[PDB]
Amino acid sequence: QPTESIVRFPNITNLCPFGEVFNATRFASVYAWNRKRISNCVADYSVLYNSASFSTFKCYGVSPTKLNDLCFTNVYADSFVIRGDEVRQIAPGQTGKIADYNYKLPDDFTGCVIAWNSNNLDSKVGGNYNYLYRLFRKSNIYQAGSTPCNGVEGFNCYFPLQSYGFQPTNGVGYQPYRVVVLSFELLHAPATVCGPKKSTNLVKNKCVNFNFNGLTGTGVLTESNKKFLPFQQFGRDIADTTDAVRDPQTLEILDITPCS
């Protein structure tokens, strides 16, 4: 019987730029609440599982521990900043003003939503006045009234700005917090986004199962010195078998012999 099962995978290089969440220092432009496409990179979610220091991270359609198994064409990272009273109401299948009247999410929207404390860093003692609301849709220059002013003072004609009452003094339930949605899309495209695939320590000259980048087999390995360039997989001098296999870290060429 084979002794133990073995998997060997290459070192991780492409880290998702989630660091724009840990080290975000500034707010986005008014037109551009942060909606970014994420592709051609490996998404490391392992830190989020055991971080446990942030307000919420609840996410639906996929079990948390199987993210590395699934592969998606695209990831949309949509980040806003909203107040606390709506944090439990930002969820697929629920109601609300912003989620319904600005951009639609499907009732069974599968994706992963996190809410972040900004109490001691981004909150302002005098109040940050950067928060606006879009309130109305009737059907599928912007004036709050119905009649156009045409540059003439009168009814439904207003002043550019009056001081607005935004204050931090409100209670704990009422501070604003940051919201980020990571949406996974699986569509008709070559698989480019893959989760990190962890490997183990290597043991030689024992009857073992081996799994090299998905290549599964069983046997015991011996070193072969035949001339293969590192990028070479297929060749026809023996024409019969997947002769040799190459570790990603160590470029050594190993052939297999079956056990009893």
Partner: nanobody
Framework: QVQLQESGGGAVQPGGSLGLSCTAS????????VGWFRQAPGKENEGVSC????????NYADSVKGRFTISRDAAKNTVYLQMDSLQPEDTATYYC??????????????????????YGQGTQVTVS
């Protein structure tokens, strides 16, 4: 925009009655909810009454249940609140308010202070 005018406040003696009136303009509040909120010194802003004229469905705060009656006049386009057996806790400045989304049914009126988008000047009622 929407403009609100409250009137009818004053001084009352406990056991009496008072009549508040809310006049709305800039929007047709005949198929939408309009309500009365209060704020008192040392007390949080609390909604006390609301009426939806679409079927005139009524709601009152638990603190005011069984004591106040709210009605809506289409001909006057106003909201009239009648207060019977007033108590000292009813002494407050009253605001007339409405929901951003106009409702079209028997919806009970929300009495959370966050419920107002446009707000009037308010009228004082002192039960003393």
């Amino acid at each position: 925009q929407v403009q609100l005018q409250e009137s009818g406040g004053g001084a009352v003696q406990p056991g009496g009655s008072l009549g508040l009136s809310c006049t709305a303009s800039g929007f047709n509040f005949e198929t939408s909810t309009v309500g009365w909120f209060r704020q008192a010194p040392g007390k949080e802003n609390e909604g006390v009454s609301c009426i939806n004229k679409g079927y005139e469905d009524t709601n009152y705060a638990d603190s005011v249940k069984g004591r106040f009656t709210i009605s809506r006049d289409a001909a006057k386009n106003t909201v009239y609140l009648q207060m019977d057996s007033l108590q000292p806790e009813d002494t407050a400045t009253y605001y007339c308010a409405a929901h951003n989304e106009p409702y079209f049914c028997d919806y009970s009126g929300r009495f959370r202070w966050n419920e107002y988008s446009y707000y009037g000047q308010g009228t004082q009622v002192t039960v003393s």
